[PDB]
Design a protein around this ligand. Structure first.
Ligand SMILES: *[C@@H]1O[C@H](CO)[C@@H](O[C@@H]2O[C@H](CO)[C@@H](O[C@@H]3O[C@H](CO[C@H]4O[C@H](CO)[C@@H](O)[C@H](O[C@H]5O[C@H](CO)[C@@H](O)[C@H](O)[C@@H]5O[C@H]5O[C@H](CO)[C@@H](O)[C@H](O)[C@@H]5O)[C@@H]4O)[C@@H](O)[C@H](O[C@H]4O[C@H](CO)[C@@H](O)[C@H](O)[C@@H]4O[C@H]4O[C@H](CO)[C@@H](O)[C@H](O)[C@@H]4O)[C@@H]3O)[C@H](O)[C@H]2NC(C)=O)[C@H](O)[C@H]1NC(C)=O
Ligand SMILES: CN1C(=O)N(c2c(Cl)cccc2Cl)Cc2cnc(NC[C@H](O)c3ccccc3)nc21
Ligand SMILES: [Ca+2]
Ligand SMILES: [Cl-]
Ligand SMILES: [K+]
Ligand code: NA
Ligand SMILES: [Zn+2]
Length: 806
């Protein structure tokens, strides 16, 4: 109950909310049906509209007016935004030349430049160029401030997950808002866009920016705006808050616009009807900047213009129906649309089996427009698994398509022409970022970056210490004039051992064989030097990775490659090698086809054994440094060492072999040499973090050899490709992947064909940031370069998306 009997007099858009039965006057009261009786009359005034006119200039204050054109309005902080323009001969902000803002130019009493977040729903990245003619205020922000060509949203590219990621720096799996619709089995409760349950605090994890600010003594305007409050009123309210006295005035504010998303759904991303919503957003930005200029705040405030996600063309006729695949369709619940999530309709149904559902949905139709996954098999870059609110069965839907349970759901519930929600690497899902103000750089373009990074920057902008989050703090330092965050590299936790020759061949009873007993101080001094690390400068270009946890491991040197060998996991944590543009691919010679050699630096007790692979009918093995790329026939023997061997399903070997035999050379040829670091990943609990030994669910039969869930590679070269990878003077270029180590190739519908027709497509889908690999391995890469650490952090957050140009 709300006794709506109090008054909103002098309380309009109060910043501190009152607890019922006292009625509310805050910008959310409408949503709780809890506004005081006079809320509309006092707080949502509209009389005379939103602009001053020549005849209103110098008028006597009439409190009924929506905004004011009287002489007292400026000090009252409630002029119409165009007051000075109409009445005092000022120019609109958009008509002023831009001028570098080198320092905050704030009124006396401001302790820090305020931050205003101007968030626009569904604002696709390509609108900045394609709509430039009709958005002059936004274009001035973009060209004069710091801008990216686009900003990557999180998956799913829905509104609530992305806005909350913007506010927290967290992946949806960590903040808990994993969709616009959700069921939490622990609460036994549902979350929807419409309704009340979404207001319950138990849905919202992490620590959003307004809470971070409050806790550290920085006041925040309220971020949420009732849909019925018009945009002009939201702007005027922010401007009024900015005129509060020093002790009450917030330092952080957000505006939100439901456009252009609202019209995009109806008309498609580029419908002719889309021009007007873009013009209207621009006019709103103009109102804010004119209003800031009137208050002498236009060179004081940092403004961020940011979207949540883009918008794609999607129509009813592009719907796949699960009823065309499943006989048991009524035994499931589907969260439908641009992603699919499946669970059992009833938990008392013992016959329900996710394995058979997956199988009935796998590669059934020639041009099938969705692909089923167990959530832990989704591309790791999506970070979409470690939350009980994410169903075990997921469908990744092709851009432009929907999935639904049955046709009745689509025709009994074509209206829409646009939607969003798809894979966050999809170009149409990309959104915008512009930062403008004293703390941002002047006339600067920065590379595309992920929205998880912004929370750290907004904290930097407000002098706040960010709560723990998924951004990489410092990776966006290049956006900022000042207030940069200068992190130190993490300390190595475990130092390596450097074993020499300590074991005789006959101490090994591994069931391994090799035809190598075919034997000179010219080349024996030479090979000892290589085993001591004489070529390590060539193969370890950026220093050895640091191990950031407690473990026991050995560095192993070889002519063609260097590795950090784990005595706990019985395999390398990493293997590093450089392949020059000129390098030649050779074959595994016939006499070495099944060769595995004991490594006399590493005890039998810390080695794999060939017998376990022989006995394990499902499990085979591969090599981290590929024999195909050996520098010479003699160096090739090194690649067959038991310490270079890793467990691989035969199905996965098809992928790995094509990567090593064909793709590495191709990249070296295209990029003028590459350095590669490859290794295993163990993530059995799908939390995106390195497993401890006690978390491993699968071993090679009869052995303590743990089976990786994934294999990574990090492929680094010179950004200036006219310089060879091993002789690079400036910035680096990287692409990486985290390939799922799967016993079948069911994920690839064309895998019966030659690897040249399906492997690269699989690898593109499993593209990764180095930072993702760091989380998954507890390793820290690029420790020894000539580059600034912030630049290296930016490199580590880079994702090679393989999408064409926006
Ligand atoms: C991205 O960034 C984020 C933020 O840094 C990273 O997430 C963190 O990962 C940490 C390491 O796993 C994790 O640390 C754990 O914290 C537990 C206490 O957590 C509570 O308190 C914090 C602080 O206020 C709070 O943030 C948490 O909020 C979570 O939980 C609620 C759900 O009830 C949600 O509202 C919220 O959204 C968030 O959920 C997310 O995280 C949890 C895990 O905490 C997931 O399960 C959810 O699915 C969701 O993703 C909590 O309120 C603490 O209990 C843990 O300690 C256990 O394990 C350690 C192992 O080292 C051990 O030392 C302890 O003794 C303890 O073990 C005991 O409990 C075990 C489990 O019950 C049991 O098995 C044992 O036998 C023992 O009895 C642990 O320290 C941290 O909470 C999250 N933080 C957040 C915000 O998510 C994330 O890793 C980053 N991602 C990537 C890819 O890098
Ligand atoms: C997303 N969103 C909605 O979907 N709304 C809605 C609509 Cl339009 C129709 C039906 C039901 C609902 Cl709930 C109303 C709404 C109101 N205010 C906001 N503010 C977002 C805030 O500024 C912010 C938060 C995090 C980071 C940057 C900015 N977001 C809303
Ligand atoms: Ca893990
Ligand atoms: Cl959803
Ligand atoms: K085998
Ligand atoms: Na297949
Ligand atoms: Zn939408």
């Amino acid at each position: 109950w709300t006794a709506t009997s109090g008054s909103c007099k002098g309380r309009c858009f109060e910043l501190q909310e009152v607890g019922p039965p006292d009625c509310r006057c805050d910008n959310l009261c409408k949503s709780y049906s809890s506004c005081c009786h006079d809320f509309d009359e006092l707080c949502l005034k509209t009389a005379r509209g939103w602009e001053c006119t020549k005849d209103r200039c110098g008028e006597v204050r009439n409190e009924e007016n929506a905004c004011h054109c009287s002489e007292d309005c400026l000090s009252r902080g409630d002029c119409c935004t165009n007051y000075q323009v109409v009445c005092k001969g000022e120019s609109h902000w958009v008509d002023d030349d831009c001028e570098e803002i080198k320092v905050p130019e704030c009124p006396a009493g401001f302790v820090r430049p305020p931050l205003i977040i101007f968030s626009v729903d569904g604002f696709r990245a390509s609108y900045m160029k394609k709509g430039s003619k009709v958005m002059p205020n936004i274009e001035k922000l973009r060209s004069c401030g710091t801008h990216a060509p686009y900003m990557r949203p999180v998956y799913p590219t829905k509104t609530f997950p992305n806005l909350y990621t913007l506010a927290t720096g967290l992946y949806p799996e960590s903040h808990g808002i994993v969709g616009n619709s959700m069921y939490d089995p622990v609460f036994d409760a549902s979350f929807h866009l419409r309704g009340r349950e979404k207001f319950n605090h138990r849905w919202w994890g992490g620590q959003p920016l307004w809470i971070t600010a409050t806790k550290q003594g920085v006041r925040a305007g309220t971020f949420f705006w009732s849909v019925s409050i018009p945009h002009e009123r939201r702007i005027l309210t922010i401007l009024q808050w900015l005129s509060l006295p020093d002790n009450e005035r917030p330092s952080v504010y957000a505006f939100y616009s439901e456009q252009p998303d609202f019209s995009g759904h109806k008309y498609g991303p580029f419908g002719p009807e889309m021009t007007n919503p873009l013009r209207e957003i621009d006019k709103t930005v103009g109102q804010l900047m004119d209003g800031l200029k009137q208050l002498r705040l236009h060179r004081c405030v940092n403004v961020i213009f940011v979207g949540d996600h883009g918008m794609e063309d999607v129509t009813c006729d592009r719907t796949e129906f699960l009823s065309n695949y499943l006989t048991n369709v009524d035994d499931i619940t589907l969260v439908p649309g641009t992603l699919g999530r499946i669970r059992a309709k009833s938990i008392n149904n013992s016959k329900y089996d996710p394995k058979t559902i997956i199988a009935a949905l796998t590669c059934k139709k020639p041009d099938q427009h969705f692909k089923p996954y167990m959530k832990q098999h989704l591309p790791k870059r999506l970070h979409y698994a470690n939350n009980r609110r994410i169903e075990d069965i997921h469908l990744l839907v092709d851009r432009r398509w929907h999935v639904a349970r049955k046709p009745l759901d689509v025709y009994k519930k074509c209206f829409f022409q646009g939607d969003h929600g798809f894979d966050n690497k999809v170009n149409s899902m990309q959104t915008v970022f512009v930062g403008y103000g004293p703390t941002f750089k002047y006339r600067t373009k920065v590379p595309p970056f992920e929205n998880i990074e912004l929370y750290n920057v907004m904290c930097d902008l407000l002098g706040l210490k960010p709560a723990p989050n998924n951004g990489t703090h410092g990776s966006l330092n290049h956006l900022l004039r000042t207030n940069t965050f200068r992190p130190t590299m993490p300390d190595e936790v475990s130092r390596p051992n450097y074993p020499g020759i300590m074991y005789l061949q006959s101490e090994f009873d591994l069931g391994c064989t090799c035809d190598d007993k075919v034997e000179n101080k010219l080349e024996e001094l030479n090979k000892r030097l290589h085993t001591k690390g004489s070529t390590k400068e060539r193969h370890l270009l950026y220093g050895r990775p640091a191990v950031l946890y407690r473990t026991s491991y050995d560095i192993l040197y070889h002519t063609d490659f260097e590795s950090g060998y784990s005595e706990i996991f019985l395999m390398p944590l990493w293997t590093s090698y450089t392949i020059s543009k000129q390098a030649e691919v050779s074959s595994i010679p016939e006499h070495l086809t099944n060769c595995v050699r004991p490594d006399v630096r590493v005890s039998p007790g810390f080695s794999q054994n060939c017998l376990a692979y022989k006995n394990d009918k499902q499990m085979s093995y591969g090599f981290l440094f590929p024999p195909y790329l050996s520098s010479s026939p003699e160096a090739k023997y090194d690649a067959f060492l038991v310490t270079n061997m890793v467990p691989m399903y035969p199905a996965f070997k098809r992928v790995w072999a094509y990567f090593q035999r064909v793709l590495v050379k191709k990249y070296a040829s295209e990029r003028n040499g590459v350095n590669v670091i490859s290794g295993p990943i163990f993530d059995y609990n799908y939390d995106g973090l390195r497993d401890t030994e006690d978390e491993i669910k699968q071993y090679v039969e009869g052995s303590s050899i743990p089976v990786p869930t994934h294999y990574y590679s990090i492929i680094t070269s010179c950004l200036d490709f006219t310089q060879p990878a091993d002789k690079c003077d400036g910035p680096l270029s990287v692409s990486s992947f985290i390939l799922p180590h799967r016993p079948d190739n069911d994920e690839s519908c064309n895998s019966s064909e030659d690897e040249s027709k399906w492997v690269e497509e699989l690898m593109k889908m499993h593209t990764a940031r180095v930072r993702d690999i760091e989380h998954l391995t507890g390793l820290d890469f690029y420790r020894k370069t000539s580059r600034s650490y912030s630049e290296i952090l930016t490199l580590k957050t880079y994702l090679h998306t393989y999408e064409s140009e926006i």
